[PDB]
Design a protein around this ligand. Structure first.
Ligand SMILES: NC(=O)C1=CN([C@@H]2O[C@H](COP(=O)(O)OP(=O)(O)OC[C@H]3O[C@@H](n4cnc5c(N)ncnc54)[C@H](OP(=O)(O)O)[C@@H]3O)[C@@H](O)[C@H]2O)C=CC1
Length: 281
């Protein structure tokens, strides 16, 4: 038996499970499509109800994978997509959202993010997001790859206080946000979505992670996700094209990391002692 996945609250009061699902690199190989769809469906069945995608991912292909996975069960998914900054003018953002809705085969996305900071005024992107919300095409908007200075600029734009999430790189190998951005977002009540929670697989070769996983009869990936489960105000979004790995990732939530485990992880993956440049992928 599994314990329920912990939930994370958005500023609007909506709650989502702390473990979701990613889709970057899905939709590239026709031989993998069926299993990518099955992976997302399996995750939905197991309570990993947030699914993260973007217009960038295969230029609509990953969105179409998500659209297939949610057929006949839209209400059970919390769908996140994104607008590229090169499209984030007011008219551009509306057009991007319409393309995303068509690829996803849905009326409304749950959360719509600015993918990173670009050249169009933030006030204009936010105005588009608010228009889309009033139109019933998105339920909430947020940002991604926003450092502390980028977050500060939201207070200078109308409706900037409505930001629902900041999706940034966060995993055991990439802990920089702990010094500043993560405490700020927690204090604002803005969830951090931890992208690349396995560091795209790179973290899984770490000696200490392998050591701790062995002690729990678990995998390194499960320990990496279990670490993020201990971080309040964080939603992790691991990606896998394998339904077997979707099941494994769900089971990461059953790991009980000890006080000693957490101290050991901090020795091997040192938290930041000073402000550091936001790491991105
Ligand atoms: N906002 C942004 O700028 C960004 C957003 N993202 C989002 O975050 C999501 C997750 O990050 P992502 O970059 O995909 O990388 P992840 O850290 O989620 O790692 C994905 C890799 O790990 C493998 N994998 C998954 N589960 C396991 C497991 N249990 N054991 C071993 N290997 C495993 C996958 O292989 P396989 O699929 O073959 O199983 C894949 O190669 C993205 O898919 C995207 O939705 C990511 C980067 C940037």
């Amino acid at each position: 038996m599994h314990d329920p996945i912990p939930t994370i609250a958005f500023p609007d009061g909506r709650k989502v499970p702390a473990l979701g699902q990613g889709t970057w690199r899905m939709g590239e190989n026709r031989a993998k499509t069926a299993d990518e769809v099955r992976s997302l469906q399996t995750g939905l069945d197991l309570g990993m109800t947030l699914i993260d995608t973007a217009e960038m991912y295969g230029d609509g292909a990953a969105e179409r994978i998500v659209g297939e996975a949610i057929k006949g069960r839209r209400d059970e998914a919390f769908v996140v997509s994104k607008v590229l900054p090169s499209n984030a003018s007011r008219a551009g953002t509306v057009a991007a959202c319409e393309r995303s809705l068509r690829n996803l085969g849905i009326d409304c996305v749950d959360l719509y993010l600015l993918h990173w900071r670009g050249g169009y005024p933030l006030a204009e992107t936010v105005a588009a997001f608010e228009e889309l919300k009033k139109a019933g095409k998105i339920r909430a908007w947020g940002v991604s790859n926003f450092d502390v200075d980028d977050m500060e600029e939201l207070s200078a734009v109308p409706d900037g206080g409505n930001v629902a999430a900041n999706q940034v790189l966060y995993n055991l190998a990439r802990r920089g946000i702990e010094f500043d951005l993560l405490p700020r977002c927690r204090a604002q009540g803005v969830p951090v979505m931890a992208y690349s929670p396995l560091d795209e697989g790179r973290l899984l070769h770490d000696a200490d992670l392998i050591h701790i996983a062995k002690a729990h009869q678990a995998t390194p990936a499960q320990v990496a996700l279990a670490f993020l489960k201990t971080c309040s105000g964080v939603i992790s979004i691991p990606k896998t094209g394998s339904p077997e790995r979707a099941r494994e990732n769900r089971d990461a939530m059953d790991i009980h990391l000890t006080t000693e485990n957490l101290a050991e992880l901090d020795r091997h993956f040192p938290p930041p002692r000073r402000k550091t440049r936001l790491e991105v992928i």
